[PDB]
Design a protein around this nucleic acid. Structure first.
Ligand SMILES: Nc1ccn([C@H]2C[C@H](O)[C@@H](COP(=O)(O)O)O2)c(=O)n1
Ligand SMILES: [Ca+2]
Ligand SMILES: [Zn+2]
Length: 542
DNA sequence: GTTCAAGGCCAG
DNA sequence: CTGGCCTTGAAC
């Protein structure tokens, strides 16, 4: 990666010609040549090229991915003067904050907003409470009052979070994975209001994104909840429409998930200061953001002055208002487990195949943290000799597909070994047998014969699951004849059986245990017993 | 008095 | 080496 040269990466849907002209101005004034590129899957390409000390100097992308980029140390820390931080809206600086330090510059803002038909509705409602009544008046003209993408949780969430609902609480630049406001009085209030809308068939509950877009754009529905990304379509449908504040539930504004288009600096770049100069003095200006805007819209912008210039468009003003009344979409990994655990919980509560409090309790306990005790982990997972005197078996699990879904741990309970309890857990949890899942195990004791048979059968029945088992110790009762054949039976079923090495103990120590920012402490004889036990295992399977 | 973590010795 | 078995210091 060169010095004195700036390489900028921006997605294809965002206007790169105006940004390129900004770079031409920067080269005109300074002499540093700027080259902008719009590759494909740059959100995928950037981590790999950046891990090698290569890639772009600056990367433009939504702020949520920048958290994953920040955990991998691929983003330099920025310390812009408070005089510059005052130039942008304050809540936009929270979307570029990761682990307590700024990793990117806020550029653009996106959020859900209410899109209504001006002809059918000259005065849109300001409250969800007015929606049923209105619908009954419009169901007589052959019209629906409101239809949106009830399947995905990004669209139904604003009404849920309007009253005391949230994903994870946020002390400064910090989220708390342990606390999830999915189960709450107000969250149940919003969800039950949604269910009261779908019971009366004000919304058929089968509505997806395209059904609601075809419905609204062909004049059928009077209102739909959507973002700027679809505006262009409604502009060619010849429909006269408007964008406005999302209605308020219980008098409280609904909270959509705000996405912040951001410009981050590659940590491997030698041109960090050149990048900060370009971004602070050329991009983040009225002239820079306007030059970018004329090519392709940015929606609302974080720069106060230019956002005031753009608010003359009532649509963009609505976008910024709903953004300020909403909440920043978190950038941490657990958010994935959130989406999934909510994506089902509303659907089950939508069709009526599960009651509200059950769906929301299961959703909260699903996407939430629970961590093991450090003394408990160290006691239960010690691979030594003289470890046969341990009764309880602990199992730390990870469910992924690459989307790392729920993780946690299970222990022994009333005769039910941990493997069977995980079979009941993953069975109560529904499955979509069109996509494979990759399940990882960390066990105190390896599976016994009954557990090997039950698990191997479960694997025969659900051939989309693929399991790997890391065990601390090898268990035998009636040594040398029962368990080795059971472990070979799991081997026949295609279960990757390894014995935990040191790196596995690090992974478990930093993944499943509540360590209190304490480094992992290996005991005496860990490696010796590990190669030991791995030798016995290689002797067993092969 | 009793239970347990830990370690070493010896015989296969 | 691997597995089986006693001793011990110290904690419940
Ligand atoms: N795959 C295995 C094998 C054994 N065990 C533990 C749990 C049981 O409590 C005990 C079974 O043996 P017993 O009940 O005879 O002690 O060993 C376990 O948790 N998981
Ligand atoms: Ca969990
Ligand atoms: Zn078992």
């Amino acid at each position: 990666i060169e010095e004195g040269k700036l390489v900028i990466w921006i997605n294809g849907d965002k206007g790169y010609n105006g940004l390129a002209e900004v770079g031409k101005k920067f080269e005109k004034d300074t002499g540093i040549k700027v080259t902008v590129e719009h590759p494909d899957k740059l959100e995928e390409k950037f981590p790999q090229v950046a891990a090698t000390g290569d890639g772009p100097d600056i990367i433009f992308w939504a702020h949520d991915r920048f958290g994953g980029y920040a955990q991998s140390g691929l983003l330099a820390e920025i310390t812009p003067a408070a005089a510059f931080q005052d130039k942008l809206y304050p809540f936009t600086w929270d979307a570029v904050r990761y682990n307590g330090k700024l990793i990117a510059y806020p550029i653009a803002v996106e959020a859900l907003s209410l899109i209504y038909n001006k002809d059918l509705l000259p005065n849109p409602p300001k409250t969800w409470e007015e929606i049923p009544a209105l619908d009954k008046e419009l169901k007589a003209k052959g019209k629906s009052a409101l239809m949106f993408n009830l399947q995905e949780p990004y669209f139904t969430w604003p009404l849920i979070a309007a009253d005391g609902g949230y994903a994870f609480k946020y002390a400064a630049g910090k989220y708390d994975i342990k606390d999830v406001g999915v189960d709450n009085a107000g969250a149940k209030a919003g969800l039950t209001f949604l269910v009261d809308l779908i019971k009366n068939k004000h919304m058929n509950a089968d509505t997806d994104y395209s059904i609601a877009e075809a419905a609204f754009n062909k004049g059928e529905t009077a209102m739909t909840i959507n973002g700027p990304w679809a505006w262009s379509n409604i502009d060619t449908s010849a429909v006269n429409y408007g964008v406005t504040v999302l209605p308020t539930f219980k008098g409280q504004p609904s909270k959509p998930f705000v996405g912040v288009l951001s410009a981050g600096i590659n940590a491997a770049s030698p041109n960090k200061e050149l990048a900060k100069e370009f971004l602070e003095n050329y991009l983040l200006t009225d002239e820079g953001l306007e030059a970018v805007n004329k090519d392709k819209p940015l929606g609302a912008v974080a720069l106060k002055s230019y956002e005031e210039e753009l608010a003359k468009d009532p649509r963009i003003a609505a976008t910024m208002e709903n953004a300020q009344k909403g909440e920043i979409m978190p950038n941490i990994p657990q958010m994935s487990a959130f989406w999934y655990a909510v994506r089902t919980a509303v659907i089950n509560a939508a069709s009526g195949r599960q009651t509200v409090d059950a769906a929301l309790a299961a959703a909260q306990t699903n996407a939430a943290a629970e961590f093991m005790d450090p003394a408990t982990f160290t006691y239960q997972f010690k691979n030594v000799r003289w470890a046969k005197g341990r009764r309880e078996t602990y199992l730390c699990y990870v469910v992924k597909r690459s989307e790392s879904l729920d993780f946690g741990y299970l222990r022994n309970k009333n005769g039910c070994h941990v493997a069977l309890l995980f079979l009941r857990y993953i069975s109560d949890w529904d499955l979509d047998p069109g996509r494979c899942y990759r399940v990882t195990w960390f066990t105190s004791w390896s599976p016994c014969y009954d557990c090997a048979r039950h698990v191997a059968d479960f694997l025969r029945g659900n051939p989309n699951l693929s399991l790997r088992i890391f065990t601390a110790r090898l268990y035998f009762c009636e040594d040398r004849k029962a368990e080795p054949e059971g472990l070979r039976r799991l081997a026949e079923a295609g279960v990757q059986i390894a014995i935990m090495t040191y790196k596995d103990y690090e992974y478990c120590w930093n993944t499943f245990v509540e360590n209190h920012e304490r480094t992992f402490k290996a005991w005496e004889g860990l490696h010796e017993n590990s190669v030991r036990l791995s030798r016995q295992l290689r002797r067993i399977l092969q």
